[PDB]
Design a protein around this ligand. Structure first.
Ligand SMILES: Cc1cc(SCc2sc(-c3ccc(C(F)(F)F)cc3)nc2C)ccc1OCC(=O)O
Ligand SMILES: CCCCCCCO[C@@H]1O[C@H](CO)[C@@H](O)[C@H](O)[C@H]1O
Ligand SMILES: CCCCCCCO[C@@H]1O[C@H](CO)[C@@H](O)[C@H](O)[C@H]1O
Length: 264
């Protein structure tokens, strides 16, 4: 029953993944191998005028400085990805079967881990794609921002480069992300056994998918479990840096949805 049942299960989640995420790793890698390079104030200014963003510039807070503007651009991209992760989750029948409060709990504590995991898809050692792959913001430019804003993004690059060395494709990622969302460990969950059961099914689907898709990649599955653990620490460290900013930079605002996610 299992292997055939789980291949169908995997196929469905892969389809949900393709349906709800505009930028695939496949699409991203092709571009990363002709986007407009953002590497300083002038080119970002030109990008804001030239490129097509999902969130219009006039919708963002009034311009103060480059570091804070980038910080707001990060929030915009995050909120957009959270929107897609929500529809991705809702496109998974077992997820949508959960009570709505549990759905919210899983998304609340899950999306940032998933975002940092998916972030690698549009990242190389030199920078990351923005504006639907129309732009490419350099890693050095992001390093050049003033404290505390420069230190937030660099750890995500470090994780991504190691993560991309595993060479997962979109079919692997769909299951990997699904396993991050449907996680029985989240605080305040109502029906833990049910979520743990779904999570187990996804992980069994993944281990079989990896054997079929990556037959010669030894220890690939336990390595990915470790990355799931690593992502929890990355998010923990991220939340601390975000907290530092709210305290020290009282002038800067936080998007209301993100306020709710960080409410604790
Ligand atoms: C401050 C912060 C940094 C990250 S790191 C990963 C990144 S970096 C980036 C980016 C986009 C656009 C630009 C450009 F285009 F403005 F340069 C630069 C950077 N979007 C993402 C997703 C994630 C989340 C963050 O805050 C929101 C939150 O915690 O919910
Ligand atoms: C099934 C629809 C009706 C659900 C009604 C119960 C809602 O409970 C609330 O769920 C939230 C997590 O989503 C928690 O943050 C709140 O603390 C909790 O009180
Ligand atoms: C839209 C999907 C992602 C939403 C993530 C934001 C979750 O916020 C939480 O919503 C719960 C019910 O409103 C509240 O009980 C919690 O206190 C709050 O922290």
């Amino acid at each position: 029953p299992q292997v055939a049942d789980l291949k169908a299960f995997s196929k469905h989640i892969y389809n949900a993944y393709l349906k709800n995420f505009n930028m695939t790793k496949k699409k991203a890698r092709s571009i990363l191998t002709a986007p407009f390079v953002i590497h300083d104030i002038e080119t970002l200014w030109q990008a804001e005028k030239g490129l097509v963003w999902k969130q219009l510039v006039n919708g963002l807070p009034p311009y103060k400085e480059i570091s804070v503007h980038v910080f707001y651009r990060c929030q915009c991209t995050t909120v957009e990805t959270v929107r897609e992760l929500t529809e991705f989750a809702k496109s998974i029948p077992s997820f949508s079967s959960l009570f709505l409060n549990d759905q919210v709990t899983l998304l609340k504590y899950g999306v940032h881990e998933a975002i940092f995991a998916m972030l690698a898809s549009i990242v190389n050692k030199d920078g990351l794609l923005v504006a639907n792959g129309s732009g490419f913001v350099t890693r050095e430019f992001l390093r050049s921002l003033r404290k505390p804003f420069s230190d937030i993004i660099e750890p995500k690059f470090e994780f991504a480069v190691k993560f991309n060395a595993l060479e997962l494709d979109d079919s692997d990622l769909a299951l990997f992300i699904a396993a991050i969302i449907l996680c029985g460990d989240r605080p305040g969950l109502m029906n833990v056994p049910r979520v743990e059961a779904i999570q187990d099914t996804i992980l069994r689907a993944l281990e079989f998918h990896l054997q079929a898709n990556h037959p010669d990649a030894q220890y690939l599955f336990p390595k990915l479990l470790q990355k799931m653990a690593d992502l929890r620490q990355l998010v923990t460290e991220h939340a601390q840096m975000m907290q530092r900013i709210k305290k020290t930079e009282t002038e800067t605002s936080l998007h209301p949805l993100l306020q709710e996610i960080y409410k604790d």
